[model samples]
Target chain A: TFFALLLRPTL
Target chain B: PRNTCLGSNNMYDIFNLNDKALCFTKCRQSGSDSCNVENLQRYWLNYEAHLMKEGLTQKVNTPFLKALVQNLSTNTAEDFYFSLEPSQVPRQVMKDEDKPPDRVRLPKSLFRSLPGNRSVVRLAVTILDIGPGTLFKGPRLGLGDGSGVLNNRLVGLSVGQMHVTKLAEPLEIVFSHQRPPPNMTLTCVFWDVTKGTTGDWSSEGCSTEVRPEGTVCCCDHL
Candidate 1:
């Protein structure tokens, strides 16, 4: 099982 | 559908392989002329965890997107920090100061949207090689108009999701007011989060005052 942490520039 | 079933790799890195401890990693831009910066692979972009399928690799910094649960640092500031990779492979066309940075520019065809309250924190590809004229451009999107805001003064933000930049061509959006000043750098020193001491990366390229013509794309000596 895995979770894909979608990339967003709003860091 | 309630499920804690993601994948095998998620256990060690995402699912807290180390006793549910947040994986401390960093993400930032590496200069085109730097030696330490690693070449970005399509399958595996910024976060190290995404690089390998089911095997262990270097530190993956995607977790910082969600409250930085474990505390991560940039530019070798912490023990487990992954370098920031703001965008995909891009060509340095304009030396314009308005752009984020030479190395962190997105390919223009990708949608790696990781924006919040108009602000964005990314690991540019060229920051590591930025020498002498180490001019860096940081994004500061302010939520001023919104009445129900939390922080009054314009400040930076933290991560919201993990591996937010692992998208098609990195990402881009309207973003918020560039803190310190819009589009201008807010810091330069490496950010610290270990032992509860939180700070920003020295390479942030910020000081007491914001740069001139910060909103404009063209400027001299910043």
Candidate 2:
């Protein structure tokens, strides 16, 4: 199964 | 310039091998102007294509994402975010495995040390279902070590171009887990690569809290 991901930079 | 490069509304045409190559060329040639937040977000729209291209390999996917971040950092910009959920991908489900977490929140302080010009920082979270034994083979589990097995999926976090170890504010990760029985306990640990031949999970810089719906793991390192 594929895994979920959220990638971002904060201020 | 951005419109001319990413005018296609079709995801397939935009993320295909040829288009990726074309986009990379355009972004590299024009630098931040063509590779700014707007265009980067467009690339993120086909995150699955990028993931599938490398067969879900973290080593490859991370650098690709970081390259995009690097391009954006060349220009001054505000907060940028992209998220992908498991439900978005068409796949067969395991009999008893829980779904991976859909969201993550990072603190702004984590990038405090970055230069003023290079304000954009890159972070990537990868969830692996592979058991710890396969990649983290080390000393045997001692007695009373909870279930003595990794009951939940392994969540790996990475920060581009920064060797992040300790942080002033802890990084929070909320994920689904199989609640431990009365005798067992949920623990938060990191795969310490400095351990024996193969890395081992250590709880030195992390902690865990179990909730009715899921668990929240807080760590001070990448």
True contacts kept of each: 0.00, 0.00
- Residue-by-residue lDDT tens digits, candidate 2, B79-148: 3222223223212223354544543444544565454655544544444332222222234342223234
Clashes of each: 62, 0
Q: List, residue by residue over B74-179, the lDDT tens digit for candidate 1.
A: 2322112221222222222344334442112233222123343323223222111111111111122112221111111111122333332333432211112334
RMSD of each: 18.7, 16.2
Compared with the true structure, the alpha-carbon lDDT of candidate 2 equals 0.42
TM-score, per-candidate, Cα-based: 0.21, 0.50
Docking class of 1: incorrect
Q: Model 1 reaches what TM-score against the true structure?
A: 0.21
